[PDB]
Amino acid sequence: RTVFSSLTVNGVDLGQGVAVRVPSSNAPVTDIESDDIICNTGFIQPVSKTVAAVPAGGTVIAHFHHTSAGYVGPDPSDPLDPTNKGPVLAYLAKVPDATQSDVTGLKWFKIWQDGYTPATRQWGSDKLFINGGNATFTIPSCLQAGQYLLRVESISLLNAEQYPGAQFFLSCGQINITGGNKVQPVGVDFPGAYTSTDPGIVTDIYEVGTYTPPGPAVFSC
């Protein structure tokens, strides 16, 4: 179990819960056809009305911790329980207002993921753990400036031998991309992009040889 609950933008920590819609607990989303797959559910109120200004090309850290509280000292399952092998993924969607409550019907493009490396048997979850919950990635430099949601997700495949089984731990950050260019990427639907036939979602981790994370290929400029 894990929760994305804070952001750093080009080395500046924004603060616990700031510009993130933080779920009330670390309970997983398990239904890929639920609207809960978009940005989770049951947000801590009142939800932040901060929209983090981020230059296109800028470096963002999405901070995962074991619980919705963020860092509360030593915990062997902070940022996640390391037995919970799986990928880490980041997506953006262009939105009219990054504080708007309705997150349905958006078009999500993947900007980063950390899957599995067979030769080292290392998962993105392992790297996330080593990195103290820091999922660090850059915002594509060519993107159209404006308001976006930043969906960052940790998937535990520990029990993903059938569907339902995969456990999805995700939140949406609220960002305002500045500078940039004019690229408006093709995105996918949530729900929709993840299906019960995807070997990225239905996976026996004790029988993994190669692994491909679910969803579209990573967008690059």
Ligand SMILES: *[C@@H]1O[C@H](CO)[C@@H](O[C@@H]2O[C@H](CO)[C@@H](O[C@@H]3O[C@H](CO)[C@@H](O)[C@H](O)[C@@H]3O)[C@H](O)[C@H]2NC(C)=O)[C@H](O)[C@H]1NC(C)=O
């Ligand atoms: C995960 O990310 C956190 C949150 O940003 C990392 O902590 C931060 O690390 C930075 C960069 O090394 C520290 O910056 C330094 O600040 C000191 C003064 O406080 C200054 O003298 C240096 O010039 C430098 O800019 C920052 O202080 C620190 N912020 C925290 C701890 O809140 C953390 O290291 C990352 N964890 C892992 C395992 O990578």
Ligand SMILES: *[C@H]1O[C@H](CO)[C@@H](O)[C@H](O)[C@@H]1O
């Ligand atoms: C954000 O900052 C990182 C270093 O923290 C760079 O690697 C990246 O190019 C971007 O400037």
Ligand SMILES: [Cl-]
């Ligand atoms: Cl746990």
Ligand SMILES: [Cl-]
């Ligand atoms: Cl460009």
